[PDB]
Known about the structure:
Site (Alkylation inactivates the enzyme) (chains A, B, C, D): 145
Strand order of the largest sheet of chain A: 8-7-6-3-2-1-10-9
Shape of chain A: globular
Number of domains of chain A: 1
Organism (chains A, B, C, D): Oryctolagus cuniculus
Catalytic activity (chains A, B, C, D): beta-D-fructose 1,6-bisphosphate = D-glyceraldehyde 3-phosphate + dihydroxyacetone phosphate
Structural class of chain A: alpha/beta
Oligomer: homotetramer
Keywords (chains A, B, C, D): Acetylation, Cytoplasm, Glycolysis, Hydroxylation, Isopeptide bond, Lyase, Phosphoprotein, Schiff base, Ubl conjugation
Distance between the termini of chain A: 55 Å
Function (chains A, B, C, D): Plays a key role in glycolysis and gluconeogenesis. In addition, may also function as scaffolding protein.
Amino acid sequence: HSHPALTPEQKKELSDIAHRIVAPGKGILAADESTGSIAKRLQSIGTENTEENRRFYRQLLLTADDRVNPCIGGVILFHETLYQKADDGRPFPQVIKSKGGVVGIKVDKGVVPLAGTNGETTTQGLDGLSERCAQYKKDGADFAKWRCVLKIGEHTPSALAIMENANVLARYASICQQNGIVPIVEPEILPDGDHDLKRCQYVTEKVLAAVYKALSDHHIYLEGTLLKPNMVTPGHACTQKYSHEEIAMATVTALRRTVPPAVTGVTFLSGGQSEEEASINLNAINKCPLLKPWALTFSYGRALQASALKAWGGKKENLKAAQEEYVKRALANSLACQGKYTP
Amino acid sequence: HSHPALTPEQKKELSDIAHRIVAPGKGILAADESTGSIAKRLQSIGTENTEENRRFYRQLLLTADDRVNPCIGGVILFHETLYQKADDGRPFPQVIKSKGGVVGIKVDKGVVPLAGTNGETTTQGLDGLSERCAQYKKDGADFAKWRCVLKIGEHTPSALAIMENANVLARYASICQQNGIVPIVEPEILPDGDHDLKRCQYVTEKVLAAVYKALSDHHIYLEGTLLKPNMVTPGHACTQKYSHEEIAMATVTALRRTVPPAVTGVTFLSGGQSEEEASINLNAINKCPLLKPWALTFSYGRALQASALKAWGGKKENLKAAQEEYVKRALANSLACQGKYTP
Amino acid sequence: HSHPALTPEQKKELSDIAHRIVAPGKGILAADESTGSIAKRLQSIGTENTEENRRFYRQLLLTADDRVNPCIGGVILFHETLYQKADDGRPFPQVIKSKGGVVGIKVDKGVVPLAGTNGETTTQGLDGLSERCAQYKKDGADFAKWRCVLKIGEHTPSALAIMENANVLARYASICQQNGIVPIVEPEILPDGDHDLKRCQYVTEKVLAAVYKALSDHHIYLEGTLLKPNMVTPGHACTQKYSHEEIAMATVTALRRTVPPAVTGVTFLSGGQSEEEASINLNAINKCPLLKPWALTFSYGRALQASALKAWGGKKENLKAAQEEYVKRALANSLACQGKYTP
Amino acid sequence: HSHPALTPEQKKELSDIAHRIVAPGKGILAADESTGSIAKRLQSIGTENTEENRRFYRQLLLTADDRVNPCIGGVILFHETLYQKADDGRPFPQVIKSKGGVVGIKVDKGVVPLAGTNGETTTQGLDGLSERCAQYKKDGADFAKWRCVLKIGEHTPSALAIMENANVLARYASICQQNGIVPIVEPEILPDGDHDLKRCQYVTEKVLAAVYKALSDHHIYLEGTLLKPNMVTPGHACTQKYSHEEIAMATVTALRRTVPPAVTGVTFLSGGQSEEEASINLNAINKCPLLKPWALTFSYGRALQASALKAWGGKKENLKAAQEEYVKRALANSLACQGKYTP
C-alpha cells in the first residue's frame, strides 16, 4: 500500500529548486568550511582565526563581480555564515539571493568511527534535523549537504560501511525532503592509497548502487535531489599515469551504470585535486561521447577559492585582485560545465 | 578486490548483440509459446495440436514478406523450434538469420509456488543452464529470455517474492552472460485485480529497484542485457478510465526513476492488452516529452500474431492473408517504436 | 578480515555487568520516566510537577526497605536523576550501588516520524552518544536503554520500519559497547489494535530476526547485551480471550525461534498490562515446559510502581505505606522471575 | 499478514522426524558418495567401479551388527541406493527402517562457479525438487541433505557467495518442508588454506547468521530442520597448534552466538579430519562447560567408514572384519555424542 511522502506541490517546489541549482552553465560554490578546516587554511596563509577574518573572507567570496551571476547557481554556507551580515547591511543569504543564487547549508555533525572495522567512519547529525531544517528554511536555505567518508584499502570499504552510510544518507534525504529542502547526497570516496582506475570504478559502482537502493527503500523523491560524487581517479600513491579521457570515460561509465536519469544533476568534487586539473577533468567529462541524461556540473570547495585565498594574503587592500582570481576560476568552471573549456 | 567476470572481448560481443537487437525501428517477436499455451490457442481456433500444425504456424510467422526486415530484429523461439526445419530445407535459426534477425530462446522451466505466501510464485530452470546455454550458442541462439511472475493483491508482492525473483533473475543473467548470451530480464507484473495507476507505478518502481540492486550484486554487465517490463496500466477490474498519455507518463516516470542508462533497450510486454491499444500505448510512450536514454521498443507475443492466428483458421490456403495481417501489425509496431504511429 | 571491536578485557567486563544485572531472582526497575510522562502520571494523582516532587518520588522508589536487595539488580534512571541527591547527602547512583544495584540511564531522544509510512516511527539520539556514554560511565552508569516503537496495523510494520529500527538499535549497541556500557535492546511492539496471538507472534519473530541480523552485521558482542522484548499478547480490541499458558507458550515459542543463547538475559515489558497480570504472565513464562537457555526476568516501569504512586497521593506522611506497596510488587516479581509465584 | 506455510499436523510430523534423527546417543551415517567420489575411493583401494561393487560396499555398511542400533538414527543415501536391493531381498530403505533408522537422500546436483568471484561456488539442483521430494517420500525418505561450499581466502567469502548460498539453502528447505521432508542445512566451510581459529570462527558466525536470516525470510519451520556445520578448526597450512579444548570452545562459542534453540540438532562434519581426531573433537565439544540447548551429534562420511573400507580390500571374505571396524567407530562416535568417550 502506498502512502505518499510528498504532495504534488512539494514535489513541484523541490523539482523547481533542484532545476534552478544545476541550470546549464551554473555550478556550486562550497564555502561550508568549518572552524578547524578554515583554521588550518588561515594558518597556511599566516593569519589569526577570528570571526571578523572569516566574515571578511566570505565577504570576498560572496560579494564578487557580477560576471559570476551565470556561473554560481548555489552556495553552501556554514551555520554561522547564515547569521552573519555584510558591511553594507545585507545578511549573506540576501547577498546570495540578490544576484540569482540559492542558499545552502552544511548540516552534518562530523564523522564517528565504526567499531570492528579498519578505520571506517560513519556520519553524525540526525538528531533535531527536522526542527533545524525548518529553521534554515525560514532563514532562506533551500538546499542542504551531507558528507559521508569511504576509503579504499585492503578489504575496505566493507558491506557494513556502505550499508550504514547509504542508510544514513537516505534518512537525511527523507528528513530534508519533508521540510522542502533539496538534499545533496555526497558519498565521497577518498583518493588516498595506491589503486588504479578499475578498482576506484568498482568501488564507485558498488557504493552508488547501495546508495540508490537505500534511496529507493526510503521513498525519496529522486527528481528533487542532487548527487555529489567524486571523480573516478587513481590513488595518490598509484604509479600509473592516466590521460584525462580515460578518467572521464571511467567516471561517465561508473555513473551511467548506476544513476537513474530522474536525478536532476551531478555535482562533482575537487577531492584534493589541483585548481586547473579539476576544470580540465570536468571539461573532459562533459566532452565524453556517451549519452549523459543529467546535469554535469561542479561543486568545488578548494578548486574555486585556493588562488583567491593565496592572492588575498590576509590583507584588505589586495581584495579585488583576490576576487579577480576567484572570478577567473568561476568563469573557467562554467565552461567546464558546458564542454567549451580550453586552457 | 575486483576479479572481472568478463573480458573486454566478451563485453564487446554482448554489447554488439544487444545493440543489434534493439536497433532503432526494430522489435522482438515472441514465438516462444509452449505446448500448453499454444494448445489453448489452437483449441480457440479449433484445430488439433500436432508437431506439424505448430511447425506450420511458426512457418507462417517466420517466413513472412521482406517488409518485416527493418521491423523484427530478434525472434524468441521454443527449445523445439530451434531444431525444426522449414519445408525449403533451412532450419528456423537460418531462416531468422537470413533476413537480419537474431535468434533467441525461452529458457525457464515454469513457475513454482512459494511457501507461506498468498499465491506468489518464483521461477524454475537454473540447473544445467551453462551447458544448455553453450548448446544454444552453438545452435545460433544469441539471446535468451526468463519470465518472473508477480501479482498485486492485498499485501502482495511481499519482500520475499521480489527478493527471490530478483536473485533468480540475476543468477540467470550471470549464467547467460558467462556463455556469450544476452539476457532479457522480464519482471512481469500481472494486471489482474483492481488497482489504479499509482499503486502499479509504486510496485513497478519497487520491483525494478530490487531487480537492479540484485543485478549490481551479481556483477552483471548492464550494457549487454535487455529489460522486459510491463507497461504501467490499471487493473482489469479497475473502474477508473485513464488516457494513453497518463499511462505513458506513468510508465516513463516509473522507468526513469529506476533504470540506469547503461541498459541497452527496454522491450515492453503486451500483457493481456488488445492488438491496437498496445501499439497505441507504445506510440504514446515514445511520444512522452521526457528524456529517455534507452531504446523503447516492443516484445509482443499475442499483440503481433493474434490477427494472423484468427485469419489463418488452421487452413493452408489462407496463409498469405494471415501473413499479411501479421505484416500489418509488425509495420504498425515499428512506427510505435519511433513515435511516428497514427491509427 | 577480522579487526576486533573489543579486547578480551572489555568482553569480560561487559559479560560481568550483564551477568550481574539478570542474576537469578533479580530484575530491573524502570524509573526512567521523562518530564512529560511523569507529568501525566503526577497529574493523574493530582499534584504539581516540580523538581522536588520528582526527586521525592524517586526517593520513595530508590530508598525502600532492604528486602528489595535480592529483587532489583538494576535501576534505569533519567539524565536528571543521575545528578540529583538524596536528603541524606548521597547521590542516587551511590544509593543504588550501596545496596547491590546497577545504575542505568535512558539515552534516546524520542521518536521521529518516518516519511511515506502509515504512522511508523524511528528513534532519535545517536549524536554525541560516545561522549555522553563516557560521561555516564564516569558517573556510575554501567548499562543503558533505547526504545524503538513498532505498531501492528493493516500493512504495518513494513520492511522499512523494521530495517531502520534494527539498524539504529545495532548502531546504538555498538556505540554503547565501545564505552564499556551494556546495551539493552528494546524492540517494543505496541499492543494497540485488534490482532490475535498468531499475528503478534509472527511480527515478533520477524522483528527480532531483523534485529539480531543487524546486531550480527555491526559486530556486537552478544554476551554483553540484554534483550527487552514485549510479551506476545493479543491486542486491546481483540475479542478472543486467551489463557496465560497460551500467552506464555506464544512468548517462549517466539523467543526460542530467534534469540541465540549467547544473549545473557531477557527482560520483559509490562506494556500497558495490569499490575498483577504482568507478574502472572511472567510466572507462566517461567513455568513453560520448554528449554529456555537465558535469564527470564522483568523490567517493569508501571507494573512495579503504580500501586506505590496510588498509595502515595503526593503526601509525605503516607511514604512508608506507599513504599510497602512497592516492596510487595517487587517481592512478587522476584518470584515471577523464578517460577515460584502464586497469587 | 500471515499465511501459514504448514498446518500443525505437518509441523508435528516434521518435529517428530527431526527428534527421531538426533535422539540422544544417535548419529548420522553419510553413505551418499556419488560415482566420482566413490570411484576415487575404490581406486585408492584398488578395485574397479561397478554397480555390484558399490552395492556390496553399501551392503557392508548397512547390514552390520545389531550393536549399531542405538548408534545410527539416520542414514543418508544416494538416489541409486534407494532403488538397490540387498541379497536377502529387502531393499535398502527397508533394511534401514527394520533396525530403527531413518532413510535420507542427498538431493543436490553439484556446484556451479559464481561469475566475478575468486573461485566461489553455489549449489545446483532446485528444478523438479517438489516432484522428486514427493517421490522420495513415497519411497521411504524422511529427510534430505544439501551441501554448500564456502572457502576462506584473501577476500573470500564475499557477501555475494554467502547471500546466494543462504538463499538457495532456504529455498531448498522450503521445498523440502512442503513435502514432509526434514531438511538438513549444510553450510560447509572448507578447511583449506592457512587461517587461525579466530578467522574461521568469524567466518562461521557470519555465514551462519546470514543462513538463519535467510531461513527466517522464507518462513522455515526451524523445529523441523537440522543444522550440519563444520567444526571451527584451523586451516591445513596453519602453523599454530591448538588443543582440542580450544577447538571445542571456538565451535560452541560460534554456535551459541548464532543458532536459535528451536533448531532440533547439530550434526557435525568430519571435514577432512582423521578417524580418531573427529571423535576426540566431538567428545571435547560435548564436554564444554557451557549451556548447549540442542543435540550435538555426528554426521560422518569418511570418519565412520575409512577403516572399514581399508579393512575390506575389495574381498568378500574379509567382510565381517571390515564390518567390525565400522562398528567400533560407530560405538566410539556414540560416546562422542554423549561426552562419555575416552581413547
